[PDB]
Amino acid sequence: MNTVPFTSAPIEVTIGIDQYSFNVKENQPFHGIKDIPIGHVHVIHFQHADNSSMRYGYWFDCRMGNFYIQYDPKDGLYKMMEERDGAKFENIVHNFKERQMMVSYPKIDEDDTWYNLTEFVQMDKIRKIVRKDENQFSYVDSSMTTVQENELSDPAHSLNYTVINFKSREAIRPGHEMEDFLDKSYYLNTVMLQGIFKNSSNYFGELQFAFLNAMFFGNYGSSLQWHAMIELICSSATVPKHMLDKLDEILYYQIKTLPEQYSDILLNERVWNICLYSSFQKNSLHNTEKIMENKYPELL
Amino acid sequence: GAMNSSNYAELFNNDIKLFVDDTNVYRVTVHKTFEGNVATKAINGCIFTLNPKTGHLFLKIIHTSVWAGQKRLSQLAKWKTAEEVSALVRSLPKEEQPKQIIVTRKAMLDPLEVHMLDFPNIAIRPTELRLPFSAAMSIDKLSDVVMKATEPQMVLFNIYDDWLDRISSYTAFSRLTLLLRALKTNEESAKMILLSDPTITIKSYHLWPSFTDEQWITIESQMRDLILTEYGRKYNV
Ligand SMILES: CCn1nnnc1NCc1cccs1
Numbered sequence: 001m002n003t004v005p006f007t008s009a010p011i012e013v014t015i016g017i018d019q020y021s022f023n024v025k026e027n028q029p030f031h032g033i034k035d036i037p038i039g040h041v042h043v044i045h046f047q048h049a050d051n052s053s054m055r056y057g058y059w060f061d062c063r064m065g066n067f068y069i070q071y072d073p074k075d076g077l078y079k080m081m082e083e084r085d086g087a088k089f090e091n092i093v094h095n096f097k098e099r100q101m102m103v104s105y106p107k108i109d110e111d112d113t114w115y116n117l118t119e120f121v122q123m124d125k126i127r128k129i130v131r132k133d134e135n136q137f138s139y140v141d142s143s144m145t146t147v148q149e150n151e152l153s154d155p156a157h158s159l160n161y162t163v164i165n166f167k168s169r170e171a172i173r174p175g176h177e178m179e180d181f182l183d184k185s186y187y188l189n190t191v192m193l194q195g196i197f198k199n200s201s202n203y204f205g206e207l208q209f210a211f212l213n214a215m216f217f218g219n220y221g222s223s224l225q226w227h228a229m230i231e232l233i234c235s236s237a238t239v240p241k242h243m244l245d246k247l248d249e250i251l252y253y254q255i256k257t258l259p260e261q262y263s264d265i266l267l268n269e270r271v272w273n274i275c276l277y278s279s280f281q282k283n284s285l286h287n288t289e290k291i292m293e294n295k296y297p298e299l300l
Numbered sequence: 301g302a303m304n305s306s307n308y309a310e311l312f313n314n315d316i317k318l319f320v321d322d323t324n325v326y327r328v329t330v331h332k333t334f335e336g337n338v339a340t341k342a343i344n345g346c347i348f349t350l351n352p353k354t355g356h357l358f359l360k361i362i363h364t365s366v367w368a369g370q371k372r373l374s375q376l377a378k379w380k381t382a383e384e385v386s387a388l389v390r391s392l393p394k395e396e397q398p399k400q401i402i403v404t405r406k407a408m409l410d411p412l413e414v415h416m417l418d419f420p421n422i423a424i425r426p427t428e429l430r431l432p433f434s435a436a437m438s439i440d441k442l443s444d445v446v447m448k449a450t451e452p453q454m455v456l457f458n459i460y461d462d463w464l465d466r467i468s469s470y471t472a473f474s475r476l477t478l479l480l481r482a483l484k485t486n487e488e489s490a491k492m493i494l495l496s497d498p499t500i501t502i503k504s505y506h507l508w509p510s511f512t513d514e515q516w517i518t519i520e521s522q523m524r525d526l527i528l529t530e531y532g533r534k535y536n537v
Contacts, residue, residue, distance in 0.1 A: 177415050
């Protein structure tokens with residue numbers, strides 16, 4: 001179990017760690033988060049009490065280094081940094097665990113939620129969507145735009161998700177215009193799965209990462225990307241049976257975890273109704289359809 | 301964006317544009333089978349592709365053989381339309397290709413956009429106008445060439461005859477849409493108006509009769525009356 005210490009908490013802030021969150025008061029004696037499960041990526045995220053504008057945060061994996069947070073009063077945010085000196089960090093964090101100035105990552109033992117939400121998400125793929133190679137961790141906020149969003153303006157701060165566009169030459173073989181537009185299997189299996197992603201795990205990884213950035217940061221282009229990747233599967237007549245079964249599990253936990261009061265903005269009526277009721281895969285998503293109907297029957 | 305009453309004069313500017321109407325592409329007669337079920341029999345159709353500035357009409361005849369062994373024909377018909385319009389554009393010299401294609405029904409937008417991906421600079425536009433181009437098959441010589449076709453065939457017409465020698469494109473289009481609206485609302489009466497007078501003939505190389513300027517005003521007045529009338533006979537006013 002690993003630890004993300006804080007030098008201090010100078011400004012009042014709601015801190016999130018994965019799907020958990022807690023409030024820290026201005027100059028309250030908070031030194032960090034302990035007992036963070038190893039083996040998963042994590043995200044630590046922030047919303048200042050004074051300016052709820054800009055949720056922001058950091059994707060990280062404690063296996064890739066020792067990471068800590070110090071408030072930068074010039075840039076006005078909590079910054080993640082990597083501590084290179086291992087012995088110093090251990091002496092600093094022990095010192096802190098002894099004074100009990102850390103919140104414990106509050107994982108219930110029965111609970112597989114975070115695993116289920118990050119099953120295919122891998123730091124190495126995050127770092128290709130979020131390009132900042134001098135850091136082992138990845139900053140995301142509310143306002144960052146996607147490569148595709150910029151095509152329709154600062155490139156270094158973009159989310160480099162895989163561009164999906166159903167009315168594009170990439171998606172439509174010459175002479176199979178109608179076939180490929182009404183059945184996207186070519187685009188899914190050959191262009192995207194075989195060509196770009198190499199396998200379904202990488203595809204699901206990006207899909208799950210897009211969802212998490214949409215949910216935790218309200219990042220609109222991430223929400224666009226999540227829905228597009230769902231729609232591309234649901235609109236393909238020919239999908240491997242293992243992908244459909246896994247897709248249903250993935251979406252089930254995403255819908256289960258979504259805050260009830262954000263469903264109005266984070267869920268695209270058109271995509272979901274098409275996917276669950278009109279698409280080729282309308283009968284292949286039993287778990288997701290059941291949770292969607294019992295929790296958001298209004299959307300449908 | 302969409303074409304409507306507000307930007308109507310754009311039709312007659314010098315940017316090449318085409319209207320595409322697909323109403324008459326997939327045409328059927330519905331009938332009873334021996335067993336008392338219902339079946340359709342397709343008849344020849346056409347794509348109506350019209351330059352509103354010049355009157356040039358690209359009439360792509362859709363022979364019933366193109367439906368043989370196909371399913372979901374009403375959906376296929378929109379993609380076939382889009383395929384044939386794209387093939388037409390590719391066949392035109394670059395300086396004759398449209399800058400815009402306006403579809404008369406919004407269900408053509410995605411089919412045409414997908415078929416025209418190679419032409420990103422050609423705008424595919426809907427319209428809010430309720431244009432009467434479905435009545436094209438009420439023009440005898442157009443109906444005749446469609447029904448007689450034994451194979452896919454493109455036939456070129458000028459749907460304004462020689463009117464542009466004497467009137468503007470705007471006025472020519474208004475005449476065309478009035479004639480077609482009349483034919484669509486009451487075909488028998490509209491044709492009676494157009495041919496009541498034996499002395500006014502249709503030139504071999506024309507579609508409509510050779511009216512003088514004064515006779516066209518009379519004709520146009522009569523067509524308006526017909527449209528208002530039928531609007532009464534329909535609504536009882
Ligand atoms: C009270 C903060 N402190 N106490 N002793 N050293 C430090 N530096 C802060 C940190 C550096 C790395 C992680 S936390």
